[PDB]
Amino acid sequence: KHKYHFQKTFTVSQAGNCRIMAYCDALSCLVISQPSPQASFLPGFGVKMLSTANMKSQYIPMHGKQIRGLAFSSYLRGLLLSASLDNTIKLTSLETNTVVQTYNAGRPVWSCCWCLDEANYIYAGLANGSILVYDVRNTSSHVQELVAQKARCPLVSLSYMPRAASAAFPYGGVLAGTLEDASFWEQKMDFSHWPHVLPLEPGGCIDFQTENSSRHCLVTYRPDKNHTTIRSVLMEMSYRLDDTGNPICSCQPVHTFFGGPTCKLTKNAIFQSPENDGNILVCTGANSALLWDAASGSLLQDLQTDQPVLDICPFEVNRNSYLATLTEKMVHIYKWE
């Protein structure tokens, strides 16, 4: 059987404080959030670009406070979306190595993601539980606000589920999690969004990860209980129609993978096996990252590391598949072999 084997470790930030990673397939570029290289650049936060073609790159200054989201869109080549506790959403071009657009959200931004349906929309999750929807065609302000349904507390996770020709769940929209609440914001034909409460009760942390083909999401969270533990639940999206013919959207657990006692939470991953057999892998962050088979719910690999894993990111370059795990100072590269 093939599996991931350790290749190399790269130091990202001697000062630590790395948090999240994103990969641009079109430019073969892994970006990693870090504080600025100290006593070299001005103080702040930005990303180190790592060229995966060469496995070499450079630092791009972006924000004044910690980065809480990073995402590339498929529609705008190399255009990095970032969210920061400095109250901004920014678009930074890997083509230009410069910040090309800033939106001042007016409040700390705890998450962001792109629309995967037919729009260049940005979702920004705020400290008060609202989602602002920005349209790249409008550079001055947001075009929608999706207000907090229950509590007003930070919206810490956003993950887009694209529409599909699937009888199980054809709809597209954004999965959204605050510290105490989870909803699916269905995108309608007219590009407005409608909320659907999900049967999850977060109690201090939550992270949504989506797998497009399979209409599943991975939700890693702590339940709202006094004494509990973090778990990662592989969820299948579902729906029924109301009397007007509009859907009521929900989800149900397939597999529950129990984890650790505490919330400061690995941004996990869910993705297609490099084997291209339609199997899906679930990778969960102890000083280990565990890889699970989504079909069977059984464990495939335990990738050991000297430090806690903060983020996990699969990537492909030159007909080979890789996995990156991020710790506070370093990134570990594994190859599928």
Ligand SMILES: [Mg+2]
């Ligand atoms: Mg990711």
